[PDB]
Structure formats: structure tokens, C-alpha cells
Amino acid sequence: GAQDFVPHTADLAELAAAAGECRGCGLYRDATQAVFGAGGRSARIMMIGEQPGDKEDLAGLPFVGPAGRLLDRALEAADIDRDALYVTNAVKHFKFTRAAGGKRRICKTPSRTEVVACRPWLIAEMTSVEPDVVVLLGATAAKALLGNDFRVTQHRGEVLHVDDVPGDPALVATVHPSSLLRGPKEERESAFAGLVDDLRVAADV
Ligand SMILES: O=c1cc[nH]c(=O)[nH]1
Ligand code: SF4
């Protein structure tokens, strides 16, 4: 996968530039650019989404669109400062299609193959940042570190620890913020509160 493209450095700027030249799977072709993680190596909390979406692919930054604004609202309710986080995604190139009459590029799910191909960047990020806790936002991120059979819905609120993860950080798997954007008002509000709960669990680690 991406392993030959990952240089022997923990400097995030060098890692990010190297990711721009990655060909570890096919996703680099149609994306605009790689979207590396944002934040600094002093971060105690790392958060991992699925992939850059439409806005991120062009902004060059993770979580800048509607799922990002909802995450900001949850972080602020959890009194977590986003500037103090390291925020990234399991795959670094936007996988997408267009529908006729659609108003945006639509994200397509990364295959497990692509996730495994890109995981070396995630490993380099964790080795570089040495977070105390990793928040996994959604199924793809959670499976990247916890195994392909892992179910986010069955482990809400739980602090996890697995053996093949750099520095043995605490892991907290939670709902993807994109899932909180749609549905009945009451279901959204209860899901938002659970997101805030899971963020508080990670920060109290
Ligand atoms: O950075 C982003 C934006 C949207 N969705 C994700 O999973 N990550
Ligand atoms: S998605 Fe990841 S592995 Fe695939 S080309 Fe982009 S950076 Fe490399």
C-alpha cells in the first residue's frame, strides 16, 4: 500500500508533503490533493474521520464542511478546544462521484483495501503525535484500528485498548458527525448528546 511512500520522519509538515505524492492506492488520481491531518504533535487527543469530503478536498484541511461544523458544536459542548486536537482521516484522498442535478460531489465508501493501503499514514501520524486518546468517528475509522468486524453501535461510551496500535493509546469509537445531520429532531438531539458524552470520555482519559 502506502508504505514505501511514507518517509522516516515524525515531522508532520514533511509527512503531509510526502502524502501529496502518495500512489499507495488508486484514490490519488481523481482527488484534487491529499488531505493530511491538522494540528500539532503536542496534541493529547487525536480524532480520525473517514476521508476528506467535497469541501475538504479543495480546502486541503479535514472537517471543514457541514459535518465539521456539527463536530465543532459538539467539541465546544464537551469543552474541548479544537486547536488542541490532531484531526485526520483514515484515507487521505477523496473518493467520490457526481449525480446529475446534484449540488455536490458525493463521498463513496473506501474499500477495506484502500483503508489498509492508507493505514501507514495513520500509523505515522500516531507515532508522530503520540496521543493519549484516539477518537474514531464512524465505522471506517473505527474498523481501521479495531478490526473489520468491529461495530461502533455496540461499543458506545467504552474506553478501548488494542495491542497493535502505537503507544497503546486509549481508543473511543463514536458516531460519525455526518450521521447527526439528518433524521427526526429528537433522534438528532439524543445522538448529539451521545457524541458529546463520548468526546467527554476521551478527554477525561
Ligand atoms: O474531514 C472529513 C470531512 C468529512 N467527513 C470525514 O470523515 N472527514
Ligand atoms: S488514499 Fe491514502 S494510500 Fe491511497 S493514494 Fe491517497 S494517501 Fe495514498
Author numbering: 3 to 207
Authors' own words:
However, UdgX is unique in possessing a flexible R-loop (105KRRIH109). Our earlier studies allowed us to propose a reaction mechanism of UdgX, which involves the formation of a covalent bond between H109 of UdgX with the C1′ position of the target deoxyribose sugar concurrently with the uracil excision from this site in DNA.
Substitutions of His109 in MsmUdgX with Ser, Gly, Ala, Gln, Cys and Lys showed the loss of its covalent complex formation with DNA but gained canonical UDG activities. However, H109 substitutions by Gln or Lys, showed poor activity. Both Cys and Ala mutations of H109 showed intermediate Kcat/Km values. However, to better understand the mechanism of uracil excision by the H109 mutants, we determined their structures along with a pentameric DNA, TTUTT by X-ray crystallography. It suggested that the initial increase in UDG activity (H109K to H109Q to H109G) occurred because of the efficiency with which the water molecule could be localized to make a nucleophilic attack on the C1′ position.
